[PDB]
Swiss-Prot record, chains A, E:
GO terms for cellular component: actin filament; actin filament bundle; cell body; cytoplasm; filamentous actin; filopodium; lamellipodium; skeletal muscle myofibril. The modification N6-malonyllysine is found at residue 61. GO terms for molecular function: actin monomer binding; ATP binding; calcium ion binding; calcium-dependent protein binding; cytoskeletal motor activator activity; hydrolase activity; identical protein binding; magnesium ion binding. Keywords: Acetylation, ADP-ribosylation, ATP-binding, Cytoplasm, Cytoskeleton, Hydrolase, Methylation, Muscle protein, Nucleotide-binding, Oxidation. Transmembrane segments: none annotated. Belongs to the actin family. It is found in: Cytoplasm, Cytoskeleton. GO terms for biological process: actin filament bundle assembly; actin filament polymerization; mesenchyme migration; positive regulation of gene expression; skeletal muscle fiber development; skeletal muscle thin filament assembly. Actins are highly conserved proteins that are involved in various types of cell motility and are ubiquitously expressed in all eukaryotic cells. The modification N-acetylaspartate is found at residue 1. It comes from Oryctolagus cuniculus (Rabbit). It comes from the Eukaryota. This is Actin, alpha skeletal muscle. It catalyses: ATP + H2O = ADP + phosphate + H(+).
From Swiss-Prot, chains B, C:
Belongs to the tropomyosin family. The chain holds residues 230 to 284 of 284 of the full protein. Binds to actin filaments in muscle and non-muscle cells. Plays a central role, in association with the troponin complex, in the calcium dependent regulation of vertebrate striated muscle contraction. Smooth muscle contraction is regulated by interaction with caldesmon. In non-muscle cells is implicated in stabilizing cytoskeleton actin filaments. Homodimer. Heterodimer of an alpha (TPM1, TPM3 or TPM4) and a beta (TPM2) chain. Interacts with HRG (via the HRR domain); the interaction contributes to the antiangiogenic properties of the histidine/proline-rich region (HRR) of HRG. Interacts (via N-terminus) with LMOD2 (via N-terminus) and TMOD1 (via N-terminus). The molecule is in a coiled coil structure that is formed by 2 polypeptide chains. The sequence exhibits a prominent seven-residues periodicity. The gene is TPM1. Transmembrane segments: none annotated. It is found in: Cytoplasm, Cytoskeleton. Phosphorylated at Ser-54 by DAPK1 in response to oxidative stress and this phosphorylation enhances stress fiber formation in endothelial cells. This is Tropomyosin alpha-1 chain. It comes from Oryctolagus cuniculus (Rabbit).
Length: 372, 55, 55, 186, 372
């Protein structure tokens, strides 16, 4: 129990932090990855002067603060502001003292060696956690779907990745990163919806375009004769009621937004798209392992939640793969937390105890120890 | 022997290239300074010929 | 071997110096052309600012 | 409308409609975009012969010293008017770091200005220095602002449409009656 | 003079074409081996609609065209697009009419019999050249270094080869091909340089990583205690100024890029490396000819130009070869054009006239004639 209860799992994202206790089924804490700094001197009624704001209080009060994102494209870019988000996570969100809890953290696919050593330096030397561990994100997603070999298409708020994993070892030279994700996708909907003849003028109009994207957006299979369908004008249309009455209608654009993930050309991106990239990762791997990867395309991440994403991907890679092959696109329902759940499982596991980096290992080996 | 000669001369050719490259960058920079100091006086000009044809 | 290397590079450094010397003479000449094309528009200017202050 | 308020705020009244309309003629004639808008306010205070009085429809000589440039500083600072958007120079730049990489030296040496509101004197110098200091030093900046710029758009059309080669792009009633509005839409 | 002046030499590569007149000291024409096809309908000011673009106009205008490489790994893969590059070479680059010029062409090491017959079919039947000849590339490189027996390590843009040649006959069963070359090498630098904490974001950032590779990259001898040297941080570092001011620094990676040619493991390649392959070619040849090959390792190709390549190779094979042997790594300065120069010499030669395949030979013997 000492640490059975006690292991923490913190998944640091570009848009959201997911956090909680190893053992739980889902994150106890989910909140924006921002750190707000007040543009002016003054106070809220009853509070003192605050130097900084994190998560939702930074979002809610955004009009008087300069908002900053510590993690650009999955990599920690500002370490002063990240130690601020961690502090908030332990002390306010989970309300635990960190110096008696083992902490499993996550990093990104080709996270620079030096960063994995730096967050270890900050975990052990400024938070004084007993022990910690850094798992790679795609690797926890895979594992949370039971398996050990597969290829994860991972897509969240600032990055998309393909991480081919074989008997647990993520394959460095076959990993692909596509910098277009849910953030890019909300801003494109924004324009095709103002372009539908609308105005997201106040900040209460801006924010909810993102809630339109999440609730009403679709990834149609045969996106071709779906536009064609749009035109005959079926009961395909969908009206959402705004903060007030102002019933906005979205028929068609509803799927023009996730067609951006297959066609980056919709947004002036010259890069290849999700399905081709799944494939290219795969023809960059060893030959003998390619049947395995093909029958185990595990999807994880908030942006892979658009319904019919899996069917489109299913047919997208069947038709690029040699017919002798078995294609299989696994997309679980909890996928917006796969990464986290894979960490919860792993860290609560009976056999993981012997991989925890302890302060004994650290004080004796330097940050190098956990770096592997 | 051919060597001491090829190397010594290479060093002199390299010293001369760095000298001339340094003088090309000063003239090319003195330059965009002149070329630009003008777009300003020739444009201040279409302007300062248009208002007296109007006044 | 040290030789083939010293000589081949001496030749490349000499080719680069003649290239940069050729580019310095073209920029320095494009130059007195720019520097002069101006004295004319800046002088057409004190003139074409004085008559509208007068009219 | 912003000048209007900083001028009523200077202790004035644009009360009748013959007072309203002419604030716009003050903006056009006397407004400036100072470079180093910082130590221009500072200059205002020492009170130099920077001031400028305009005579209204009648005698009522109104003086505008300072606000004269506080109005176009709104184009670089939208915060002067409760706008949270970025300003002209940053936006020039952001457009540019949204374009292909190989074309960014071209765009930087060819910032063409057009439109009635880009006519404020010293707009080009401020923009010149505004983007030099945001652009990588290896770059050539060049802000072209012609004198006829309040009609650039029109003049470009006059040229193009009187041109010898444009005849073959005109959409004719033949094209239209045969192809529908789609024809010209491209 | 009839043809003394008149012989053309065209060396077709995976990245570059080298072309010019037999007699000259270096290629009159060097340009990318691409054929661009416009993605949209429209025109440049003053030009007409162009169906196709080749060489540098395809590179310069790459944003509106779909670029294609006719020669994959030294072998012509698309014959419609190759006839396009030849057309461009004769008519625009060298501005000659082909029907009055003998043409010496080059092919790759184990170029399929059928291809040598096909480019002969296209040379004589669609370009109507008087006479032509196909030389093997390593063989022209050797010969341009004066000799007739040696082993060429040839390395350009898409392929590396080892072609042991004895009294002029390239030895089919001892030739080795390693598909990792300068193209692969620019993309690896790219990653170790973004990994140094950088961004080659716009296309004007992409292209110049290749000019960094060419200007600043090195092949260190004792690549071991060169990394060690990197750490003590000597004045080994080297900063390059980008299209603009943005002074980028490259200290160390500078040589980590050509260490890829000895260690393919740096790039997820399981194949052996350049020096071992030189050697293996050699222990695949007759016994009595192995002292000859060892004292005549001729290097040619753009990617063998990295300084200190020869010293590393010198010591790489001395230490694999029996000590009774004399090792000798010849690397001339003009080596990025060895192949071409060997063709210029040969084709301007007094004795070569009697090996030219003439339209008389062809119209009478079929493509078989030149195939040998």
């Amino acid at each position: 129990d000492e640490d059975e209860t006690t292991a923490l799992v913190c998944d640091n994202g570009s848009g959201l932090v997911k956090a909680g206790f190893a053992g739980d089924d889902a994150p106890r804490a989910v909140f924006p990855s921002i750190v707000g700094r007040p543009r002016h001197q003054g106070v809220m009624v009853g509070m003192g002067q605050k130097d900084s704001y994190v998560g939702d209080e930074a979002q809610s009060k955004r009009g008087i603060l300069t908002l900053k994102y510590p993690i650009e494209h999955g990599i920690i870019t500002n370490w002063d502001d990240m130690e601020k988000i961690w502090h908030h996570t332990f002390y306010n969100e989970l309300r635990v003292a960190p110096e008696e809890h083992p902490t499993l953290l996550t990093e990104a696919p080709l996270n620079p060696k030096a960063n994995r050593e730096k967050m270890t330096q900050i975990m052990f030397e400024t938070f004084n956690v007993p022990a910690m561990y850094v798992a790679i994100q795609a690797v926890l997603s895979l594992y949370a779907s039971g398996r050990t070999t597969g290829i994860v298409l991972d897509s969240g708020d600032g990055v998309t990745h393909n991480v081919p994993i074989y008997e647990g070892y993520a394959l460095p030279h076959a990993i692909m990163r596509l910098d277009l994700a849910g953030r890019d996708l909300t801003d494109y909907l924004m324009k095709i919806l103002t372009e539908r003849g609308y105005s997201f003028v106040t900040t209460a109009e801006r924010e909810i375009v993102r809630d339109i994207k999440e609730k009403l957006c679709y990834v149609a299979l045969d996106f071709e004769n779906e536009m064609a369908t749009a035109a005959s004008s079926s009961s395909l249309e969908k009206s959402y009621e705004l903060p007030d009455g102002q019933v906005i209608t979205i028929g068609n654009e509803r799927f023009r937004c996730p067609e951006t993930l297959f066609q980056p050309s919709f947004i002036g991106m010259e890069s290849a798209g999700i399905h081709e990239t799944t494939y290219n990762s795969i023809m960059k791997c060893d030959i003998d392992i390619r049947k395995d990867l093909y029958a185990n395309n595990v999807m994880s991440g908030g942006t892979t939640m658009y319904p019919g994403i899996a069917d489109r991907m299913q047919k997208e890679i069947t038709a690029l793969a040699p017919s002798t092959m078995k294609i299989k696109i696994i997309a679980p329902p909890e996928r917006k937390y796969s990464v986290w759940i894979g960490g919860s499982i792993l860290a609560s596991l009976s056999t993981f105890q012997q991989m925890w980096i302890t302060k004994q290992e650290y004080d004796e080996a330097g940050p190098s120890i956990v770096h592997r | 022997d051919k060597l001491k000669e090829a190397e010594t001369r290479a060093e002199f050719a390299e010293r001369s290239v760095t000298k001339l490259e340094k003088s090309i960058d000063d003239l090319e920079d003195e330059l965009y300074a002149q070329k630009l100091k003008y777009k300003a006086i020739s444009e201040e000009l279409d302007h300062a010929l248009n208002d007296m044809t109007s006044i």
